[PDB]
Design an enzyme around this catalytic site. Structure first.
Site, PDB file in Angstrom:
ATOM      1  N   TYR A  26       3.069 -17.030  -9.859  1.00 31.89           N
ATOM      2  CA  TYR A  26       3.695 -15.826  -9.323  1.00 31.89           C
ATOM      3  C   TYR A  26       3.059 -14.506  -9.751  1.00 31.89           C
ATOM      4  O   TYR A  26       3.247 -13.517  -9.054  1.00 31.89           O
ATOM      5  CB  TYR A  26       5.230 -15.826  -9.573  1.00 31.89           C
ATOM      6  CG  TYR A  26       5.900 -16.809  -8.649  1.00 31.89           C
ATOM      7  CD1 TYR A  26       6.270 -16.431  -7.361  1.00 31.89           C
ATOM      8  CD2 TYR A  26       6.051 -18.139  -9.007  1.00 31.89           C
ATOM      9  CE1 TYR A  26       6.823 -17.347  -6.458  1.00 31.89           C
ATOM     10  CE2 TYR A  26       6.583 -19.067  -8.120  1.00 31.89           C
ATOM     11  CZ  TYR A  26       6.980 -18.668  -6.845  1.00 31.89           C
ATOM     12  OH  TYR A  26       7.515 -19.559  -5.943  1.00 31.89           O
ATOM     13  N   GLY A  28       0.446 -11.728  -9.834  1.00 32.81           N
ATOM     14  CA  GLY A  28      -0.619 -11.435  -8.874  1.00 32.81           C
ATOM     15  C   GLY A  28      -0.003 -11.488  -7.497  1.00 32.81           C
ATOM     16  O   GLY A  28       1.189 -11.795  -7.364  1.00 32.81           O
ATOM     17  N   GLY A  30       1.667 -12.076  -4.004  1.00 33.51           N
ATOM     18  CA  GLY A  30       2.489 -13.176  -3.510  1.00 33.51           C
ATOM     19  C   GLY A  30       2.826 -14.174  -4.609  1.00 33.51           C
ATOM     20  O   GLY A  30       3.174 -13.783  -5.724  1.00 33.51           O
ATOM     21  N   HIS A  46      10.147 -10.295 -10.578  1.00 31.31           N
ATOM     22  CA  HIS A  46       9.560  -9.002 -10.162  1.00 31.31           C
ATOM     23  C   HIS A  46       9.305  -8.964  -8.666  1.00 31.31           C
ATOM     24  O   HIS A  46       9.620  -7.966  -8.011  1.00 31.31           O
ATOM     25  CB  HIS A  46       8.260  -8.742 -10.925  1.00 31.31           C
ATOM     26  CG  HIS A  46       7.728  -7.346 -10.801  1.00 31.31           C
ATOM     27  ND1 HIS A  46       6.541  -7.056 -10.173  1.00 31.31           N
ATOM     28  CD2 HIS A  46       8.215  -6.161 -11.237  1.00 31.31           C
ATOM     29  CE1 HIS A  46       6.322  -5.758 -10.220  1.00 31.31           C
ATOM     30  NE2 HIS A  46       7.318  -5.194 -10.874  1.00 31.31           N
ATOM     31  N   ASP A  47       8.725 -10.041  -8.133  1.00 29.02           N
ATOM     32  CA  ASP A  47       8.572 -10.210  -6.688  1.00 29.02           C
ATOM     33  C   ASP A  47       9.899 -10.091  -5.945  1.00 29.02           C
ATOM     34  O   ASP A  47       9.972  -9.456  -4.880  1.00 29.02           O
ATOM     35  CB  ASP A  47       8.019 -11.600  -6.365  1.00 29.02           C
ATOM     36  CG  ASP A  47       6.555 -11.747  -6.698  1.00 29.02           C
ATOM     37  OD1 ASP A  47       5.936 -10.821  -7.275  1.00 29.02           O
ATOM     38  OD2 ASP A  47       6.014 -12.824  -6.383  1.00 29.02           O
ATOM     39  N   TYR A  50      10.942  -6.365  -5.973  1.00 25.70           N
ATOM     40  CA  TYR A  50      10.254  -5.647  -4.900  1.00 25.70           C
ATOM     41  C   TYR A  50      10.827  -5.932  -3.505  1.00 25.70           C
ATOM     42  O   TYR A  50      10.987  -5.001  -2.712  1.00 25.70           O
ATOM     43  CB  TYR A  50       8.727  -5.858  -4.958  1.00 25.70           C
ATOM     44  CG  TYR A  50       7.970  -4.950  -5.954  1.00 25.70           C
ATOM     45  CD1 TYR A  50       8.598  -4.339  -7.033  1.00 25.70           C
ATOM     46  CD2 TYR A  50       6.589  -4.761  -5.827  1.00 25.70           C
ATOM     47  CE1 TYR A  50       7.884  -3.527  -7.922  1.00 25.70           C
ATOM     48  CE2 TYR A  50       5.868  -3.955  -6.710  1.00 25.70           C
ATOM     49  CZ  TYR A  50       6.507  -3.341  -7.761  1.00 25.70           C
ATOM     50  OH  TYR A  50       5.767  -2.517  -8.614  1.00 25.70           O
ATOM     51  N   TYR A  65       5.429   6.505  -9.827  1.00 26.74           N
ATOM     52  CA  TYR A  65       6.534   7.007 -10.647  1.00 26.74           C
ATOM     53  C   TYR A  65       6.018   7.585 -11.955  1.00 26.74           C
ATOM     54  O   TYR A  65       4.804   7.553 -12.240  1.00 26.74           O
ATOM     55  CB  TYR A  65       7.582   5.919 -10.926  1.00 26.74           C
ATOM     56  CG  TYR A  65       7.038   4.693 -11.600  1.00 26.74           C
ATOM     57  CD1 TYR A  65       6.871   4.640 -12.980  1.00 26.74           C
ATOM     58  CD2 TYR A  65       6.716   3.552 -10.850  1.00 26.74           C
ATOM     59  CE1 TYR A  65       6.379   3.481 -13.605  1.00 26.74           C
ATOM     60  CE2 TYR A  65       6.215   2.407 -11.457  1.00 26.74           C
ATOM     61  CZ  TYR A  65       6.038   2.365 -12.830  1.00 26.74           C
ATOM     62  OH  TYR A  65       5.539   1.226 -13.418  1.00 26.74           O
ATOM     63  N   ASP A  90       9.544  -2.613 -12.478  1.00 24.45           N
ATOM     64  CA  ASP A  90       8.387  -2.767 -13.401  1.00 24.45           C
ATOM     65  C   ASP A  90       8.847  -2.896 -14.863  1.00 24.45           C
ATOM     66  O   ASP A  90       8.341  -3.728 -15.633  1.00 24.45           O
ATOM     67  CB  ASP A  90       7.423  -1.587 -13.225  1.00 24.45           C
ATOM     68  CG  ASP A  90       6.691  -1.612 -11.874  1.00 24.45           C
ATOM     69  OD1 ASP A  90       7.015  -2.429 -10.995  1.00 24.45           O
ATOM     70  OD2 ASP A  90       5.762  -0.830 -11.680  1.00 24.45           O
TER      71      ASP A  90
HETATM   72  C1  LIG Z   1       1.363  -8.735 -13.387  1.00 21.89           C
HETATM   73  C2  LIG Z   1       1.062  -8.409 -11.910  1.00 21.89           C
HETATM   74  C3  LIG Z   1       1.941  -8.483 -10.917  1.00 21.89           C
HETATM   75  C4  LIG Z   1       3.239  -8.853 -11.080  1.00 21.89           C
HETATM   76  O1  LIG Z   1       3.994  -8.322 -11.900  1.00 21.89           O
HETATM   77  C5  LIG Z   1       3.782 -10.007 -10.213  1.00 21.89           C
HETATM   78  N1  LIG Z   1       5.068 -10.243 -10.357  1.00 21.89           N
HETATM   79  O2  LIG Z   1       3.084 -10.611  -9.400  1.00 21.89           O
HETATM   80  C6  LIG Z   1       1.315  -8.109  -9.760  1.00 21.89           C
HETATM   81  C7  LIG Z   1       1.674  -7.981  -8.443  1.00 21.89           C
HETATM   82  O3  LIG Z   1       2.971  -8.274  -8.083  1.00 21.89           O
HETATM   83  C8  LIG Z   1       3.681  -7.508  -7.084  1.00 21.89           C
HETATM   84  C9  LIG Z   1       3.919  -8.346  -5.796  1.00 21.89           C
HETATM   85  O4  LIG Z   1       3.108  -9.287  -5.561  1.00 21.89           O
HETATM   86  O5  LIG Z   1       4.923  -8.018  -5.086  1.00 21.89           O
HETATM   87  C10 LIG Z   1       0.744  -7.586  -7.460  1.00 21.89           C
HETATM   88  C11 LIG Z   1      -0.554  -7.300  -7.838  1.00 21.89           C
HETATM   89  C12 LIG Z   1      -0.878  -7.447  -9.184  1.00 21.89           C
HETATM   90  C13 LIG Z   1       0.030  -7.837 -10.108  1.00 21.89           C
HETATM   91  N2  LIG Z   1      -0.130  -8.004 -11.435  1.00 21.89           N
HETATM   92  C14 LIG Z   1      -1.443  -7.797 -12.183  1.00 21.89           C
HETATM   93  C15 LIG Z   1      -1.719  -6.398 -12.428  1.00 21.89           C
HETATM   94  C16 LIG Z   1      -0.649  -5.539 -12.752  1.00 21.89           C
HETATM   95  C17 LIG Z   1      -0.837  -4.181 -13.002  1.00 21.89           C
HETATM   96  C18 LIG Z   1      -2.104  -3.634 -12.956  1.00 21.89           C
HETATM   97  C19 LIG Z   1      -3.186  -4.441 -12.651  1.00 21.89           C
HETATM   98  C20 LIG Z   1      -3.028  -5.811 -12.396  1.00 21.89           C
HETATM   99  C21 LIG Z   1      -4.246  -6.441 -12.094  1.00 21.89           C
HETATM  100  C22 LIG Z   1      -5.134  -6.800 -13.115  1.00 21.89           C
HETATM  101  C23 LIG Z   1      -6.363  -7.400 -12.803  1.00 21.89           C
HETATM  102  C24 LIG Z   1      -6.722  -7.621 -11.468  1.00 21.89           C
HETATM  103  C25 LIG Z   1      -5.845  -7.247 -10.447  1.00 21.89           C
HETATM  104  C26 LIG Z   1      -4.619  -6.650 -10.758  1.00 21.89           C
HETATM  105 CA   LIG Z   2       3.573 -12.042  -7.448  1.00 21.46          CA
HETATM  106 CL   LIG Z   3      14.421  -8.047 -11.402  1.00 19.89          CL
END
Ligand SMILES: Cc1c(C(=O)C(N)=O)c2c(OCC(=O)O)cccc2n1Cc1ccccc1-c1ccccc1
Ligand SMILES: [Ca+2]
Ligand SMILES: [Cl-]
Ligand SMILES: [Cl-]
Length: 123
Positions: A26, A28, A30, A46-47, A50, A65, A90
């Site tokens: 989860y 990253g 999706g 977290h997904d 959102y 924010y 977040d």
């Molecule tokens: C931990 C996390 C996420 C989540 O908390 C999650 N629940 O999937 C996340 C994320 O989740 C939001 C979603 O898919 O709705 C999307 C993109 C990167 C994500 N990341 C990685 C990430 C977060 C903040 C800043 C950068 C990165 C990141 C680091 C390396 C490469 C790419 C992104």
């Molecule tokens: Ca995710």
């Molecule tokens: Cl939550």
């Protein structure tokens, strides 16, 4: 638009944000199937967070924010309610990451998506 979330992760965990991208099934973009561990559940939640914000008319993937961190915790802020809601999703996640640092396992960073199996739990 997630440099602020990454900053929050690093502040709260001592790890780079890189260490939470691709984590398990989860963390990253999706995600699917059954979470590998508690940190992965954080991301599943977290997904879900959102998704709720998208149904309120917010764009949490894009919202910018403001936040600070004292000893009293994480203070969220922003001009709009959507920005503040995004910060709250977040915050809960970053706190969840910190809380499960004890079971963080490096083998799950950059987890192959083929290893994701089982049902997908609902929100
Ligand atoms: C931990 C996390 C996420 C989540 O908390 C999650 N629940 O999937 C996340 C994320 O989740 C939001 C979603 O898919 O709705 C999307 C993109 C990167 C994500 N990341 C990685 C990430 C977060 C903040 C800043 C950068 C990165 C990141 C680091 C390396 C490469 C790419 C992104
Ligand atoms: Ca995710
Ligand atoms: Cl939550
Ligand atoms: Cl603004």
């Amino acid at each position: 638009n997630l440099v602020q979330f990454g900053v929050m992760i690093e502040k709260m965990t001592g790890k780079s944000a890189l260490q939470y991208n691709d984590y398990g099934c989860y963390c990253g973009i999706g995600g699917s199937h059954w979470p590998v561990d508690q940190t992965d559940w954080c991301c599943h939640a977290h997904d879900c967070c959102y998704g709720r914000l998208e149904k309120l008319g917010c764009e949490p993937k894009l919202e910018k924010y403001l936040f600070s961190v004292s000893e009293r915790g994480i203070f969220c802020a922003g001009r709009t309610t959507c920005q503040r809601l995004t910060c709250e999703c977040d915050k809960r996640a970053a706190l969840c990451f910190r809380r499960n640092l004890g079971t963080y396992n490096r083998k799950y960073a950059h987890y192959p998506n083929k290893l994701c199996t089982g049902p997908t739990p609902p929100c």
